[model samples]
Target: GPLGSMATPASAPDTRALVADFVGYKLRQKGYVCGAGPGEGPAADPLHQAMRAAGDEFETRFRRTFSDLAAQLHVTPGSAQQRFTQVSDELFQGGPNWGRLVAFFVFGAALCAESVNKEMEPLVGQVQEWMVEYLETRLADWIHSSGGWAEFTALYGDGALEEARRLREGNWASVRTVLTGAVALGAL
Candidate 1:
């Protein structure tokens, strides 16, 4: 997945294929050569190890939330893209702060992955152009910033900030490691 680093956002290659450019090559860049992560050979990093160790738990929690969300939205298996769009459009509920939904794209990308992993693909329709736009156009810029490490936490809502802290035990390097894995896996 890291061998060839194509910068363009990809469309689905064939039936049911998914691509989220916001989380793919651009993310792979930061997690790889950009030096945003702890280092390459990710498992060598303690933070990456920690996140990998806890992956199942994180996936379970996020998946449970995603399941309940789908139920609440009455999202049919054939109309998952609509549900995705709906959820993205409403993540912040018009929260007082515009940044409340700042990292929603990453969250959604991971959720989409979880859906595929669990055979729930039918519920999400597998269309990912929106994901590509978010990943390729939006997050890539922020991820390239000089202070993106701090900037990400600042613009994202306090709730997400707190979860990120808790997930990595307050170690951002660990969070970056996990994010890299999730985003990089998109290419596979």
Candidate 2:
């Protein structure tokens, strides 16, 4: 979180309100609608309504923080890279300003760590977890139902047919356990 002079002051309530209104207007112009009651319009579904609401909130928060910072630093917004460079310059222009430089570096490191932990980690974990869950819960049924596994076994006689037979005969646990353990040991 931003701190010190970067923090929005409660005394500047009007400024905050103005920034929020500006953001809301911009988002609405960009097709966001708030409180779109059920079946009232194009945003009739619950998912659509929730998305719009979240968009509105995101825009409001983004604009509030950005506008407040811009006002504090007397920097006008333009391209994202330009704004970033301006902020970087402000923090690091002075020669050998080790304190400020180190503080900014630490802040950036924390942000990067947070981005990976909160966003990337969970996404990768979900993909692996969902893949394993789907395989364990549904893959055999799907292969058997679609006749793919049987056809492969019939054409190749790779003992996969016998394994499928075992599966169908409710010996799935034994076959799966042995096959997976063999695979694990072979991998090692």
Candidate 3:
């Protein structure tokens, strides 16, 4: 596993948080209109929250589908790149919509979960490492050309706002207040 090196060893949860953060960052610019303060962290950022929500929703919707792919990961030990890019193409062929973008995290998380179950612990970080690289090379351009994270907030922030309502924390009060006009147009 001659993957690139990092300042710290890669781990499963760390990897997930990293991907969510980076992906959320990309989606943040457009989402700024959703109204996060300057001091807000990723957890408190609207687009970040939306990306995770959409990613979680994606994983839930495709649990069985992803589990099967996880098995595919077991059988083909070194084809993670191929498998990932294939999924990437499928998800992004329609262009990088929010749901498709967050599916990258879902796919990475599923692979790590499967690796843990099979006792291939090392594979988790390996996949994690690759996930970041894939995002930088494969996805960054599309995101920028598409008008960055700001565009995502403008388009998809409503769904995120709604999802936030059902979450345990009471964080979206300001986001909803600022986004009311956009939501009223019903972009869902």
In lDDT terms, which candidate is top? 3
TM-score per candidate, chains pooled: 0.35, 0.20, 0.54
| lDDT tens readout by residue for model 2, 52-167 | 33333333433222332323223222222333334443433332121121222222222222223332333322322333343334443443554542342332233335554343
Clash-forming residue pairs, model 3: 27-149, 29-150, 30-149, 30-150, 30-151
Model 2 TM-score is: 0.20
Q: Which ten-residue region of model 3 has the weakest summed lDDT?
A: 179-188
Whichever of 1 and 3 has more TM-score, that candidate is 3
Candidate 1, poorest ten consecutive residues by summed lDDT: 179-188
Candidate 3 wrong stretches, greater than 4 Å: 1-17, 20-42, 45-47, 74-76, 153-188
Model 1 per-residue lDDT tens digits across residues 12-119: 321112232332322344322342321223322222232233332444534333443335334344555555555444432332121222234335445544454454
How far off is residue 138 in model 3, in Å? 2.8
lDDT for model 1, please: 0.37
Greater lDDT among 1 and 2 belongs to: 1
Residue 116 in model 2: shift from native, Å? 0.8
Q: TM-score-based ranking, best first?
A: 3, 1, 2
lDDT of 3 at 80: 56
